[PDB]
Amino acid sequence: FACKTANGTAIPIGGGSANVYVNLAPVVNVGQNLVVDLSTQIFCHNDYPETITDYVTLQRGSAYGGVLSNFSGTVKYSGSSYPFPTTSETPRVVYNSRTDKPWPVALYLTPVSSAGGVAIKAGSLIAVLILRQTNNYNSDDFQFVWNIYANNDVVVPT
Ligand SMILES: N#Cc1c(F)c(F)c(-c2ccc(O[C@H]3O[C@H](CO)[C@@H](O)[C@H](O)[C@@H]3O)c(Cl)c2)c(F)c1F
Protein backbone atom coordinates (compact mmCIF):
# COMPACT_ATOMS: atom_id res chain seq x y z
CA PHE A 1 0.00 0.00 0.00
CA ALA A 2 1.29 3.42 -1.02
CA CYS A 3 -0.13 6.83 -1.88
CA LYS A 4 0.71 9.81 -4.06
CA THR A 5 -0.56 13.32 -4.65
CA ALA A 6 -2.07 14.68 -7.86
CA ASN A 7 1.33 16.12 -8.86
CA GLY A 8 3.11 12.83 -8.15
CA THR A 9 4.54 13.36 -4.67
CA ALA A 10 4.59 9.89 -3.14
CA ILE A 11 4.52 8.30 0.28
CA PRO A 12 5.93 4.75 -0.03
CA ILE A 13 5.06 1.45 1.62
CA GLY A 14 5.31 1.96 5.38
CA GLY A 15 3.95 5.50 5.44
CA GLY A 16 5.55 8.86 5.99
CA SER A 17 4.48 12.42 5.21
CA ALA A 18 3.92 14.67 2.21
CA ASN A 19 2.74 18.21 1.57
CA VAL A 20 -0.45 18.88 -0.40
CA TYR A 21 -0.97 22.30 -1.98
CA VAL A 22 -4.69 22.75 -2.65
CA ASN A 23 -6.51 25.49 -4.50
CA LEU A 24 -9.15 27.12 -2.31
CA ALA A 25 -12.14 29.16 -3.37
CA PRO A 26 -10.81 32.73 -3.02
CA VAL A 27 -14.09 33.91 -1.44
CA VAL A 28 -16.26 32.27 1.22
CA ASN A 29 -19.32 34.25 2.26
CA VAL A 30 -20.72 34.17 5.77
CA GLY A 31 -22.86 31.07 6.16
CA GLN A 32 -21.24 29.30 3.19
CA ASN A 33 -18.86 26.34 3.23
CA LEU A 34 -15.23 26.41 2.16
CA VAL A 35 -14.77 22.98 0.59
CA VAL A 36 -11.32 21.41 0.58
CA ASP A 37 -11.80 18.26 -1.51
CA LEU A 38 -8.75 16.03 -1.16
CA SER A 39 -10.22 13.20 -3.27
CA THR A 40 -8.84 15.02 -6.33
CA GLN A 41 -5.43 15.42 -4.64
CA ILE A 42 -4.57 12.21 -2.75
CA PHE A 43 -4.61 8.72 -4.29
CA CYS A 44 -3.72 5.29 -2.93
CA HIS A 45 -3.49 1.72 -4.18
CA ASN A 46 -3.15 -1.86 -2.94
CA ASP A 47 0.15 -3.57 -3.81
CA TYR A 48 -1.12 -7.16 -3.58
CA PRO A 49 -4.93 -7.27 -3.90
CA GLU A 50 -4.87 -10.98 -4.83
CA THR A 51 -4.44 -11.83 -1.14
CA ILE A 52 -4.54 -8.62 0.93
CA THR A 53 -7.39 -6.22 1.62
CA ASP A 54 -6.14 -2.81 2.71
CA TYR A 55 -8.08 -0.81 5.30
CA VAL A 56 -7.74 2.97 5.45
CA THR A 57 -9.15 5.43 7.97
CA LEU A 58 -8.82 9.09 8.77
CA GLN A 59 -7.00 8.62 12.07
CA ARG A 60 -6.70 12.32 12.90
CA GLY A 61 -7.65 15.60 11.30
CA SER A 62 -6.21 18.78 12.79
CA ALA A 63 -6.73 22.44 11.89
CA TYR A 64 -4.05 25.13 11.80
CA GLY A 65 -3.63 28.81 11.03
CA GLY A 66 -6.72 30.64 9.85
CA VAL A 67 -8.82 27.47 9.79
CA LEU A 68 -8.12 26.71 13.46
CA SER A 69 -8.89 30.22 14.67
CA ASN A 70 -11.82 31.46 12.57
CA PHE A 71 -13.50 28.45 10.91
CA SER A 72 -15.87 25.72 12.05
CA GLY A 73 -15.54 22.47 10.18
CA THR A 74 -16.73 19.01 9.36
CA VAL A 75 -14.90 16.36 7.37
CA LYS A 76 -16.76 14.13 4.93
CA TYR A 77 -15.19 10.67 4.78
CA SER A 78 -16.59 8.28 2.17
CA GLY A 79 -20.01 9.91 2.17
CA SER A 80 -20.36 10.43 5.93
CA SER A 81 -19.64 13.60 7.90
CA TYR A 82 -17.72 13.98 11.16
CA PRO A 83 -16.50 16.92 13.25
CA PHE A 84 -13.31 18.64 12.10
CA PRO A 85 -10.92 18.81 13.99
CA THR A 86 -11.57 15.11 14.54
CA THR A 87 -12.63 13.48 17.81
CA SER A 88 -12.89 9.86 16.67
CA GLU A 89 -11.40 7.71 13.94
CA THR A 90 -13.54 7.06 10.89
CA PRO A 91 -14.90 3.79 9.53
CA ARG A 92 -12.54 1.96 7.20
CA VAL A 93 -12.40 2.41 3.44
CA VAL A 94 -11.17 -0.56 1.40
CA TYR A 95 -8.47 -0.51 -1.28
CA ASN A 96 -8.21 -3.71 -3.32
CA SER A 97 -6.64 -2.59 -6.61
CA ARG A 98 -3.21 -1.71 -7.97
CA THR A 99 -4.78 1.16 -9.91
CA ASP A 100 -4.85 4.37 -7.90
CA LYS A 101 -8.13 5.30 -6.20
CA PRO A 102 -9.09 8.55 -4.45
CA TRP A 103 -8.79 8.98 -0.71
CA PRO A 104 -12.39 10.21 -0.19
CA VAL A 105 -11.77 13.10 2.22
CA ALA A 106 -13.22 16.60 1.95
CA LEU A 107 -13.27 19.38 4.54
CA TYR A 108 -16.32 21.62 4.85
CA LEU A 109 -15.27 24.82 6.63
CA THR A 110 -17.70 27.60 7.52
CA PRO A 111 -16.55 31.03 8.76
CA VAL A 112 -17.13 31.77 12.44
CA SER A 113 -15.89 35.36 12.54
CA SER A 114 -14.31 37.76 10.06
CA ALA A 115 -13.46 41.44 9.68
CA GLY A 116 -13.66 41.29 5.87
CA GLY A 117 -9.95 40.56 5.32
CA VAL A 118 -7.87 37.50 4.47
CA ALA A 119 -9.19 34.63 6.59
CA ILE A 120 -6.63 32.14 5.20
CA LYS A 121 -3.23 33.32 3.98
CA ALA A 122 -1.67 31.91 0.82
CA GLY A 123 1.01 29.38 1.68
CA SER A 124 -0.18 28.71 5.24
CA LEU A 125 -0.75 25.29 6.76
CA ILE A 126 -4.50 24.78 7.14
CA ALA A 127 -4.75 21.10 8.12
CA VAL A 128 -2.89 17.91 8.93
CA LEU A 129 -4.73 14.73 7.96
CA ILE A 130 -3.33 11.39 9.11
CA LEU A 131 -4.31 8.40 7.00
CA ARG A 132 -3.94 5.13 8.91
CA GLN A 133 -3.52 2.02 6.77
CA THR A 134 -4.02 -1.49 8.13
CA ASN A 135 -4.87 -4.76 6.38
CA ASN A 136 -6.36 -8.22 6.86
CA TYR A 137 -2.95 -9.88 6.34
CA ASN A 138 -0.44 -8.82 9.01
CA SER A 139 -0.22 -6.32 11.87
CA ASP A 140 0.88 -3.41 9.67
CA ASP A 141 -0.27 -0.07 11.10
CA PHE A 142 1.20 2.71 8.96
CA GLN A 143 0.60 6.46 9.07
CA PHE A 144 0.45 8.56 5.91
CA VAL A 145 0.60 12.18 7.10
CA TRP A 146 -0.80 14.79 4.70
CA ASN A 147 0.16 18.42 5.40
CA ILE A 148 -2.46 20.58 3.68
CA TYR A 149 -1.27 24.02 2.54
CA ALA A 150 -3.35 26.75 0.93
CA ASN A 151 -2.26 27.84 -2.54
CA ASN A 152 -4.09 31.17 -2.37
CA ASP A 153 -5.69 33.69 -0.07
CA VAL A 154 -9.26 33.10 1.08
CA VAL A 155 -11.34 36.19 1.89
CA VAL A 156 -14.58 36.28 3.89
CA PRO A 157 -16.34 39.51 2.85
CA THR A 158 -18.14 41.54 5.50
N1 LIG B 1 3.78 -14.54 -4.02
C1 LIG B 1 3.69 -13.56 -3.43
C2 LIG B 1 3.56 -12.35 -2.70
C3 LIG B 1 4.09 -11.17 -3.19
F1 LIG B 1 4.73 -11.18 -4.38
C4 LIG B 1 3.92 -9.98 -2.50
F2 LIG B 1 4.47 -8.96 -2.96
C5 LIG B 1 3.38 -9.96 -1.21
C6 LIG B 1 3.13 -8.77 -0.50
C7 LIG B 1 3.13 -7.50 -1.09
C8 LIG B 1 2.92 -6.35 -0.34
C9 LIG B 1 2.87 -6.45 1.03
O1 LIG B 1 2.73 -5.42 1.91
C10 LIG B 1 2.55 -4.09 1.43
O2 LIG B 1 1.39 -4.07 0.58
C11 LIG B 1 0.21 -4.50 1.29
C12 LIG B 1 -0.97 -4.50 0.35
O3 LIG B 1 -1.06 -3.15 -0.09
C13 LIG B 1 -0.07 -3.60 2.48
O4 LIG B 1 -1.21 -4.09 3.16
C14 LIG B 1 1.13 -3.66 3.40
O5 LIG B 1 0.92 -2.83 4.54
C15 LIG B 1 2.34 -3.18 2.63
O6 LIG B 1 2.15 -1.82 2.18
C16 LIG B 1 3.02 -7.68 1.64
CL1 LIG B 1 2.96 -7.79 3.35
C17 LIG B 1 3.17 -8.82 0.89
C18 LIG B 1 2.78 -11.16 -0.76
F3 LIG B 1 2.12 -11.25 0.41
C19 LIG B 1 2.91 -12.33 -1.49
F4 LIG B 1 2.38 -13.49 -0.99
UniProtKB/Swiss-Prot annotation:
In alphabetical order, the GO MF annotations are: D-mannose binding
The name on file for this protein is: Type 1 fimbrin D-mannose specific adhesin
Q: Where in the cell is it found?
A: Fimbrium
Its taxonomic placement starts with: Bacteria, Pseudomonadati, Pseudomonadota, Gammaproteobacteria, Enterobacterales
**Highest taxon in the source lineage:** Bacteria
- Biological processes per GO annotation: cell adhesion; cell adhesion involved in single-species biofilm formation; cell-substrate adhesion; mechanosensory behavior
Q: Name one GO cellular component term.
A: pilus tip
**Family as reported in the entry's similarity comment:** Belongs to the fimbrial protein family.
Q: Which UniProt keywords apply?
A: Fimbrium, Signal
* General function of this protein: Involved in regulation of length and mediation of adhesion of type 1 fimbriae (but not necessary for the production of fimbriae). Adhesin responsible for the binding to D-mannose. It is laterally positioned at intervals in the structure of the type 1 fimbriae. In order to integrate FimH in the fimbriae FimF and FimG are needed.
